[PDB]
Design a protein around this nucleic acid. Sequence first.
RNA 1: GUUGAUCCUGCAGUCAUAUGCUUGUCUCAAAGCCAUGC
RNA 2: AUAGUGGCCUACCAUGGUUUCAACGGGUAACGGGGAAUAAGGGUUCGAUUCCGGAGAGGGAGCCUGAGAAACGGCUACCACAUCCAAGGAAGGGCAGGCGCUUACCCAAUCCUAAUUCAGGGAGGUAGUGACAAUAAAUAACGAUACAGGGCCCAUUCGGGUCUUGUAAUUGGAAUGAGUACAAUGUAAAUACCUUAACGAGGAACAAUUGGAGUCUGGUCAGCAGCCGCGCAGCUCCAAUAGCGUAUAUUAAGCUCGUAGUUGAACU
Lengths: 534, 175, 103
Amino acid sequence: LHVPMVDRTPEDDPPPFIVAVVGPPGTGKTTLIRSLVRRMTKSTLNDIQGPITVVSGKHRRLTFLECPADDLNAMIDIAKIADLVLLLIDGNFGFEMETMEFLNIAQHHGMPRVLGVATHLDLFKSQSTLRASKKRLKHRFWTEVYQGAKLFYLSGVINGRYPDREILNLSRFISVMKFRPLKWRNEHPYMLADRFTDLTHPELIETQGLQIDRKVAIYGYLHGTPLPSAPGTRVHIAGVGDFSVAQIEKLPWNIGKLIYMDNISPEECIRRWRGVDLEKFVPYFDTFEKLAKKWKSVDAIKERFLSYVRIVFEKVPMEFVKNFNPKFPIVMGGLLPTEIKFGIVKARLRRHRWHKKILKTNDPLVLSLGWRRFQTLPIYTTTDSRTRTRMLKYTPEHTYCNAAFYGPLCSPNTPFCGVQIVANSDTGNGFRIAATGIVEEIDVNIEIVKKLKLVGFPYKIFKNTAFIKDMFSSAMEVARFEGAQIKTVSGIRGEIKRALSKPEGHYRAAFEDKILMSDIVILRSWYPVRVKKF
Amino acid sequence: YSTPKRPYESSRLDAELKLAGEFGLKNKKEIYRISFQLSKIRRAARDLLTRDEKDPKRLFEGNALIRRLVRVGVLSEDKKKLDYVLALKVEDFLERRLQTQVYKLGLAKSVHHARVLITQRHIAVGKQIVNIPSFMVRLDSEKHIDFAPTSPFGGARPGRVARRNAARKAEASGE
Amino acid sequence: FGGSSHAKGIVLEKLGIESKQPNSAIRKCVRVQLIKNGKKVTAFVPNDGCLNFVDENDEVLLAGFGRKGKAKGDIPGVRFKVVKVSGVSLLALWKEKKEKPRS
RNA sequence: GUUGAUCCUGCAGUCAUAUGCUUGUCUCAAAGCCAUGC
RNA sequence: AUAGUGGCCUACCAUGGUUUCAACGGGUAACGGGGAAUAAGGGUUCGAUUCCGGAGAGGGAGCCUGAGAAACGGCUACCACAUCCAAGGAAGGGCAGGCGCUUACCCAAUCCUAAUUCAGGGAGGUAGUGACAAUAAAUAACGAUACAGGGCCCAUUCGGGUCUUGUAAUUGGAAUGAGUACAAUGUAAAUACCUUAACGAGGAACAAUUGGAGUCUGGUCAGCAGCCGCGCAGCUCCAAUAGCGUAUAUUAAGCUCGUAGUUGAACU
């Protein structure tokens, strides 16, 4: 309620509005971008320099973003910072099991206002049967995924595309309908980059090499809670790593000054301002003659009763210069205290809809936590009695685990999205969604328990005079556990008496009934194995 | 239409399916709507039993109502005394359905086999192909109910599955 | 209720209600403050668990139980049941037919 | 004209509000804020 | 004075004119009627009416054209009143439309106009929009054989009555349209509609459901002895059917007098 309140007030025309065009690579996304900006600037500009600052008057300026459908990272990176989803669809999607999983990412990380745009349904359809298919898509999406969004249908008029009233309906929905607040986004300072300049402190043998990072001046506008408040704060560069900032630039008789002037002694602050340690809690007073004679009369207390940024970096290293490219959009985050730390985190999970596998504990998983993408081994555990007595081997449809792993710690219990990684040529989406959940709590130094099983198969048993035919081969083992308490999966406990110098399985023990002849007589509580760190 | 007064009542609920068992229907909606028309007639039927004998209302709105019941093919002409009109019952409108008259006239060996033969562009009564099972034959159209000129069982084409069976013989056994 | 059929509210915390069948498996209850009245009303979630789905501190839709008051059984005096978190209707999240929003 | 026992039987309706799920074919369902233009 | 008789207007003179089977004053939230549907004519709806009459085109006064305007969908000036400025000056009238409860094509017909047998018409006509409702019916029909029976009903009972039964692609031919597609009709040029050769099934099919019970099958849980225990996954059955629930409401068994007030004999 106050997290939406901090966002809207400084936001005005030079802070843009975030709009992404997301869709398949084959369709004319770029054509829709050109005809969309054809309405804004006068009638003829059909050249793409994206991302670029779109000056849409003094009322609302915007900035537009597209990303290719094969990039696994920035498809995630665009999803959490958006304020409008504009999806372009074909006449060939809807049960395509490998091309439309990003819908779940926008479902989980925060859904803004969404849009369906139908364009290739004219070159493919020629008859009255397109009307039932469009309404069929209205049965699927987006009317079922959110009640309160409009599915648009546009003509296929690829390059040569209209300026007329249909993008006045599109710019009607863009121009009028605004954004719903995203909770955990607006508690962080976060900024999209607009311009990007490389300052190298000109040519020297300490300017280029194998290890040289230079002063990058980056340029953009602010979003969320204010980042310029102090120099030398922290930041995250997506895909590259977490860094600090060196120097940030911003382009949109008094005791209160003398206290912060640290070349002045505090007795000179008191001395200039008019006219010893907190290890003594009780404050200073004068002598009893002075306070007594001074406070003989008590009259003196008788009323006392009834925008734009120019950000400087000393980063990043030389190998990212060789990964320079046209600006496939890059976003800056801001890390908080109790999240710069590392720790073991406990998080609730479940299995994901339109996913077709199972998850062992040894296959590492790619996790998106806030602004950070990290590969971590997801060791699962369950309780069965409001206390843990086992772990599991792979998270089923049967039960839904309590997952634990080690990485960056995240106190405010954020929602938690887990992608199984594929290559750039496996499905058609850069990831495929493995599981989703929520950070439940933070807990360092916890220890999982897996109860193994020493095996003894019964054959002929009575209560007091009890042997096991086949359970052991060493006598000194039983000599050590003679002070212990044994079991059976049926639930009538035993207590071993004495090894009796027979290391053949046969030895005398105790049960508080006679264990039955279709039972399994065992022993419990085995070694509490460690956590894989990565 | 109109729903009956009680939805679940034992002697009437089993009396549904013995109508659905003989005639072979699919919905009690197709039972209730038939009783609904029999409801509206019967209220009017009791109206002309109160008024005077040889009232022209009892003549013009009586006998034409009587003759229309002979015209639809339900009231036999021996019972033409306006006192059998109260003694009408539910199955007689069910008996004049287009589905059941097929089975009575040989040709169907079931009431469910005739249901399939209605909806597959088969049997016509006049020169109009009828594919609604409730066509309500008017008793002047019984001995015109017959297999179509097209749509085999009537000839001159054997049909897409018989021609496909002919097609299989020519390609593997022949050439 | 105030006479109407439903009331929309906010989770404060998650309690503990257990069972005897099939064995001691936890059936739970949740604590919801009313948005419109400020009275604090408990509720029950009829399913296999589903405490996992909802959260602390989110938006629910309470609903009546249908007996003119009159709590069902050995759950002590709980009169209301939960239908919708975030507008997406728990039963649809129960099968798999929806995925829950961000909050 | 006045006291008891035995036998028999007995002790749902709502177009009336909101909401959830699926429907191959046919027909019929202000005295606030602004997209925009002079 | 006007196109025109006329207190219509002005000076004179007279003191008059209407009205008890009823002048005038006054209410009907229906801006007015002829008319259109259900058809008691009483009534509902529209009178914002299919035909016309009164109001207003930012508010004012003056002025015009035409046989027909009091033209604002004609002009000048006044007043509120804002837009541009090269700083001289120039200019429009605060309007619609939409949300809050995405609107295109054509004069082929009718009629009107025409520099008029040409063409035009913000006259006119033709497509977008759909569970509060609701409409028809598809999801299969008919044959064949070998294995096999402790099969079904009533009393939850103690027990009794009736045995015509199903599991196997054993297996075979039929029959069809949901949909795919030229052609023609339609023809505002024209879209859809009425027709149509060509295709097209043995269950992965060409992918119905929302329910409901069930003393059923499984898994390591208070808490412990002298001995014996307790509390998601395998299917089966019942229901209407493109429809089925859920929550709230709802229908059916102290004494007495005495006023307003009320009621009360007979009879030519």
